[PDB]
Design a binder for this molecule. Structure first.
Ligand SMILES: CC(C)N1C[C@H](C)n2c(c(O)c3c(=O)n(Cc4ccc(F)cc4)nc(N(C)S(C)(=O)=O)c32)C1=O
Ligand SMILES: CC(C)N1C[C@H](C)n2c(c(O)c3c(=O)n(Cc4ccc(F)cc4)nc(N(C)S(C)(=O)=O)c32)C1=O
Ligand SMILES: [Mg+2]
Ligand SMILES: [Mg+2]
Ligand SMILES: [Mg+2]
Ligand SMILES: [Mg+2]
Ligand SMILES: [Mg+2]
Ligand SMILES: [Mg+2]
Ligand SMILES: [N+]
Ligand SMILES: [N+]
Ligand SMILES: [Zn+2]
Ligand SMILES: [Zn+2]
Lengths: 368, 184, 368, 184
DNA sequence: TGCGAAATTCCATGACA
DNA sequence: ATTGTCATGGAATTTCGCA
DNA sequence: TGCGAAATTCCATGACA
DNA sequence: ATTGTCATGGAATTTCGCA
């Protein structure tokens, strides 16, 4: 502080203060004559307070804060002291946006068999039809075969009624859902356990994770839309038609319909494929197993040039889910406990709970 | 001639009246000829209307080329015939008083009645809830004649509910004297 | 039709029917033995009806429609007949999504002088503060200097009251706004004409066009957020503070604050820049004019590999603005009258009105 | 000594009472020393409170290093002095009964009073609405001594409202006999 | 053994609250 | 304790029909 | 006439309803 | 008849301090 600045005035050399400039006293303040002009060198014990006043004017980041300070002051390594404060401003940390993209998505292996994994979700509220408001959508992970159920509410009891009808056909190993009330209720958990079904949940507010069923929702709404053009939106009676229509539609990349992947033979629907007419059912189920294992599988795309990847013990912040008006978009900083995979982490949250979370719903806390 | 396939022929039929379960009285029985797979639908009556309502559900999953039944009024109505024609399903009737299926179907329909009878004693009223597990049993039951269950033949994979406990399916001396009391 | 297919059966050659395959009669239907198997050749007069039935099952696009047809049929150039129908399906055309990106954005010249162009917009509803709900934001295009006005409603009368206070300082040549009710009212038009101000409107539902003020909104909300952390959202009293704070904040790319660009000298605010202390006001306004003309200007970025550009007379469709549930997202096809620039067009809309519209709110109608 | 600059000194002062306009009675007059730029604010009273409320608006646009005024009660209150200190503004008072500005400011303040007087006759009540156009006139009025208008000196550009019609600013014989009637 | 055109495959775009 | 997906229609590439 | 480190510049990211 | 913008903080590049 005053120690350093005294030595400096009597022409001694201090590290960080380049000797080639002339440092002097004026108005009771140490000054230096810099190419930009004459600037005040505040004592070290003064510097934190200057940075803070500078920063607080508008809660500016590195450069804009520096530029204010540089108007009046100079000292060695200012940005280091600037950054020091930015890393300590609770308000900046929880309000600012991230500027690093997530690592490239994973493309999980397609479930090997029909009934290995169901993806499920609600669509709605839709306009009332027969006093129904929602649709339960169930998509088999392997085939993309889909079941549609109209419900009055996205409730556990409606979900249970629906799945009882579906599970009459077969029981799935796993059902995957987002964390909607209907799926996280303990009533639903009992119902699953009763049947030896494992429940698997998406990281919260990250519907990409339920991408199989989400993507199918789109198709469902799309078809419903086309069918209802110029009519009132009476969709209840259409659900069966949509179900059948979609399950029997080709995916140009696969060259198969969901029904074909499920049954290995078209039922009596229009333009039924007749290629296996001469094979026995046994020869047919044989070609089917072969088809099932050789389906195209996409691979993880290139990283963006500014992606970030989670490391154990790193400070990260969770995105606030339904942020109120004028409230920060980010929770307080928290710590990465485990890296489940390059796109999913468990964090300890200052409360501190364990939370399993998508990297897309995180940012790495800036300035360490 | 071409080998027999799933969806080639559905065998349909009603079972009832039964003791009211959630205001249901009948069961519409659908069995795929080739795989022996069974679908069950609870109805309030053996009417054309209830048949149509039920098969509307099934045929939004798979459509048979041919449906076969006896000459039930429900199935011989011209309403049911319009319905089938709309959907491109040929209807096939067995001659009156002489029902014909196949060995496989006859046996399956036997099992269903036998299985139903077994579980509706002790709880003649809880059957509506039981339909799902009846179907799973029936469909994951091993076929003596073919090496496989209907599940396996329909989907070409093992099931996640193998019913290894091939039951008695017969009535215990408890259940015998209990079913003679519900009548008496 | 029956003509063509008769010639074909007796071994004659017809264009489009490769001679190397054996064509025959069976069940009263012309068949051909193709590497995929035996397919029926329907008479030309039958083909449109087949494509349509195929297509209607699920309103599928090219490949998925083709794959259904190919199950039963063959004829020369099927996809041509497939595409023919897709271009005629009103429902597909107005429901499907686009798969071509817009051409790269324009970066319009920065207005040359303060007061050449104002950009204006409302933010809100915000939580009530002193019974105020909205903010009128006014951004000078050249400087980025900003004026903030709290209003009870995004109304013309509130806008008029506000601009009367602002225009006391100076009158702008042009005011640019989006097409919010407040700005498009004829009361507002009178008010502008009275003062010789020209009103310039964004293409509808394309706030990028008001990007100067929009971007400033973000900053405004951001600062308000930071200031209100842990307090109730009493923002009314903060507007002045935010105004001053933002107008005096550096843009690291420019190295200037909006106030500096407006006045050429800092007023008495913290860390005021002192570099021109020895210049006369006249020398100062001279350096200012120089600064103003040499500010960094961004250039139009590279096109995406699948961008489309509007051509006069082309069928295009306007995006529906606030589409109802289960209703198409696109209006009926319309015609490009004039191409104002590579990113803006005038279309005649089937009604037919002239509409000036952003390319981002258009798609080129598929299959011509 | 360093050359004089905008925001170096604001000269403030009140004008009134005036005839009620939208329940306003006074005008707070702010003139930048160097540029001669004028800001006007209508108040309900020449109080510290109304001064603070008004200057709060101005100083959210630009803050003067020094404010100068006479010894009005409004300006000599310790409330106004706290306010200025918070904002880092030095307050400067002219000695009582002897107001001192500069040639430029004195002349500007003369114009303002003269201009106001001119337009409030015929419509002594419509002045609130007129403040904006008064300011534009004042600020786009050519300075004999310097080559430029306040607008030009403040912003370093020409204005979009050049007031080429340098008016009479004097009272017509109509306006003279009209202002002797509002009093009588 | 190479041509023009038709078929197929590729793949960025966008939307699933 | 978990993880994007896939219809779409121009463009790009490959294959076909014929020689 | 070249080194290590500090300063500056670059620039993808994301959000303005 | 009109048209994206620009704070942000790591990384990349350039400049500085010294020799
Ligand atoms: C309340 C319960 C837990 N819920 C919470 C979240 C709202 N959610 C669902 C849900 O079904 C969907 C969605 O279909 N989409 C649309 C979507 C967006 C991108 C994508 F890749 C796929 C789908 N977003 C959703 N959101 C999570 S967002 C991103 O809005 O926070 C949700 C829930 O059921
Ligand atoms: C009702 C009136 C005409 N209005 C209609 C539209 C809604 N709008 C405004 C408005 O102020 C804003 C926005 O600030 N943003 C946010 C934004 C999004 C992207 C971007 F680059 C900048 C800003 N979107 C808006 N929209 C146009 S969207 C894209 O939602 O249709 C609008 C209107 O005042
Ligand atoms: Mg959901
Ligand atoms: Mg969803
Ligand atoms: Mg019978
Ligand atoms: Mg707006
Ligand atoms: Mg806006
Ligand atoms: Mg006075
Ligand atoms: N996986
Ligand atoms: N431009
Ligand atoms: Zn901060
Ligand atoms: Zn269509």
């Amino acid at each position: 502080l005053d120690a350093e600045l005294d030595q400096l005035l009597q022409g001694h050399y201090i590290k960080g203060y380049p000797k080639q400039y002339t440092y002097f006293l004026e108005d009771g303040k140490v000054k230096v004559s810099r190419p930009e002009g004459v600037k005040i060198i505040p004592p070290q014990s003064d510097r934190q307070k200057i940075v803070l006043q500078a920063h607080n004017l508008a809660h500016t980041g590195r450069e804009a804060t520096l530029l204010k300070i540089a108007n009046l002051y100079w000292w060695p390594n200012m940005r280091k002291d600037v950054v020091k404060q930015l890393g300590r401003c609770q308000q900046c940390l929880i309000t600012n946006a991230s500027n690093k993209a997530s690592g490239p998505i994973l493309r999980p292996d397609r479930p090997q068999k029909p009934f290995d994994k169901f993806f499920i979700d609600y669509i709605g509220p839709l306009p009332p039809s027969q006093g129904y408001l929602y649709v339960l959508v169930v998509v088999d992970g392997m085939t993309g075969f889909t079941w549609l159920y109209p419900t009055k509410a996205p409730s556990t009891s409606a979900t249970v009624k629906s799945l009882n009808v579906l599970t009459s056909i077969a029981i799935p190993k796993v059902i995957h859902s987002d964390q909607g009330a209907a799926f996280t209720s303990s009533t639903f958990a009992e119902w699953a356990k009763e049947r030896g079904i494992h429940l698997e949940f998406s990281t919260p507010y990250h519907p990409q994770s339920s991408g199989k069923v989400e993507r199918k929702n789109s198709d469902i709404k799309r078809l419903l839309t086309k069918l209802l053009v110029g009519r009132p939106t009476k969709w209840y009676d259409l659900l069966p038609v949509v179900q059948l229509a979609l399950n029997n539609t080709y995916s140009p990349v696969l060259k198969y319909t969901p029904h074909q992947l499920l049954f290995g033979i078209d039922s009596n629907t229009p333009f039924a494929n007749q290629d296996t007419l001469d094979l026995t059912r046994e020869e047919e189920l044989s070609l089917l197993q072969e088809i099932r294992t050789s389906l195209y599988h996409p691979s993880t795309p290139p990283a963006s040039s500014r992606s970030w990847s989670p490391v154990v013990g790193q400070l990260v912040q969770e995105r606030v889910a339904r942020p109120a008006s004028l409230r920060p978009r980010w929770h307080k900083p928290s710590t990465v406990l485990k890296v489940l995979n390059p796109r999913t982490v468990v964090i300890l949250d200052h409360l501190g709970n364990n939370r399993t979370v998508s990297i897309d719903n995180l940012k790495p806390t800036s300035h360490q | 001639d071409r080998p027999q396939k799933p969806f080639d022929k559905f065998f349909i039929d009603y079972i009832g009246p039964l003791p009211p379960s959630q205001g249901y009285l009948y069961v519409l029985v659908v069995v795929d000829g080739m795989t022996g797979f069974t679908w069950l639908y609870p109805t309030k009556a053996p009417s054309t209307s209830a048949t149509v309502k039920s098969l509307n559900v099934l045929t939004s999953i798979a459509i048979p080329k041919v449906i076969h039944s006896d000459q039930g009024a429900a199935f011989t109505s011209s309403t049911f015939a319009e319905w089938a024609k709309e959907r491109g399903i040929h209807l096939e009737f067995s001659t009156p008083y002489h029902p014909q299926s196949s060995g496989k179907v006859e046996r399956k329909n036997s099992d269903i009645k036998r299985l139903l009878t077994k579980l509706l004693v002790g709880r003649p009223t809880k059957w509506y809830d039981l339909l799902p597990v009846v179907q799973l049993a029936l469909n994951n039951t091993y076929s003596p004649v073919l090496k496989y269950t209907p599940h396996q033949l329909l989907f070409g994979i093992d099931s996640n509910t193998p019913f290894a406990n091939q039951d008695t399916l017969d009535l215990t001396r408890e259940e015998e004297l209990s079913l003679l009391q519900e009548i008496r």
